[PDB]
């Protein structure tokens, strides 16, 4: 029915388990008191590469084929340079194949150095989408590579779903998962998984109000991407949801809570200060959601809530004051 | 052997406090394993109530010590510390439904007053002198039928800190060594008593800033040699010298002492923030720095499984830049 099934999530877990961390679920008395709930924190910030994206990236490297005539990917290529590019480069290195990140000439020096530092090769393009698409396609063809989208690639979605397999095992009495949403690869994989295994468990999305395409899409009942690149401290969720993740989110996600920039900032600081966990602000989105006014509408029966702390890739130098 | 505490005291402490403290997790780091050549285990006391291990000793003290009054239960706790000890004692007081008072000189920063009240201690003012601090504390202690608790020499505190090792030995059955940052040595001594009682083959190693190397010097000379002057160190939680109660334990039951430079501390702290995503305070960086240090490299390969106590996470976020 959807672009992935529970069976695909299971193949993904089999595919990646030898190379990822089964990250712990931690608790906090303080956050319990603030929210009125029994919170559990799935610590993807301690995952290899500093985010959960290694799950989808590794699955993609281990399951996609470059061509009808070649079963083994000979390189990986992506346009995404942040947590996905880092995760995809690590997956490529594990598999002994090169990684290419397609990068506009106009990217900051910092960005270019960062990519080099995580061991990928840069391929330069023009800022135009016509240029990016041409270059990424050329690279993929020349290298016999796989292009691995950060959130719409089914093997990626299936990989991200493995988080929910762990959560359900680590937290048998869980009532709800709270998941930050950008392109919805994580949200959709988790929704498929939870609704296949234990549909009484709620799946809730958390999103910056400044980038609220997932909320608007669920509100309208059709895919409504951001018209303009969003401004948010939550840099990992600036993608819009897309054609593969939207149908899953429409049908299998119970609710979407949006949060202000101030709420994201305050929740991130709270996690740093009270839990001593170096989350990136994007991972504060889910915490903000559970602290927000609208989350009080959630039935008191929904007591045990697992929030995914999705990443820890923060540049601390410039992060304190943001 | 015989010392100010025995393992029996640690067992009592565990029963006294276990219902109110976190059994903190032990985490691991692939990168740190590779950098040291060891299997490291990180006992995460930065996740403990109040943000440090000190609630163990503080709660044990609040539940064990008696005031100088009619009724056997303390009606208050009075403190000098606005740091980890003070915050831990304040929380232990809240659990027991008794006021915590902190004696503060008239001229302490308005910032630090706000911070004191943030954790719920009641400020009693004194004049800025060691005479006035002491005498106000005594008065308040007596008038409130309260108790005072030394941060590292009090036997109830030392016994409480030992509870760390009880957990570690359960959590890491094959542990070969514990690495523990040392200031006053309450934690190091409580750990040593526990380890040597339960599994004496496990090594107990102390870690300390080279800028405050009283523990190293003491062990070298075979006598208690406190720091000549108050040390300057980024490791603000280990500025105290070892005292008369912890020294004998440390002399007899601690296997070795590793010192680390300020740069080694700062670097180890940053490494933990960046690579483990754990907001340790620099004092907790001391033990990591120790296992990374050249001198530690020379330690026998049979000592494979090493548990480092990440002792606290109470760090000023804004001041994190430039440490
Ligand atoms: Ca969005
Ligand atoms: Ca010292
Ligand atoms: Mg239930
Ligand atoms: Na192809
Ligand atoms: Na499974
Ligand atoms: Na599709």
Numbering used by the authors:
A (entry chain AAA): 4 to 325
B (entry chain CCC): 3 to 325
Sentences from the paper on this structure:
In contrast, in ‘open’ hSR structures, Tyr121 sits in the core of the small domain with its hydroxyl contacting the key catalytic residue Ser84. Analysis of 600 fragment-soaked hSR crystals revealed 44 interesting binding events, of which twelve had displaced Tyr 121 from the core of the small domain in at least one of the four subunits in the asymmetric unit. One of these is a 1.53 Å crystal structure of hSR bound to compound 1-x0495. The difference between the conformations of the A- and C-subunits can be seen when there is no compound bound to either subunit. Interestingly, of the four subunits in the asymmetric unit, subunit C is locked in a slightly different open conformation. and compound 13-x0430, was only observed to bind to the C subunit.
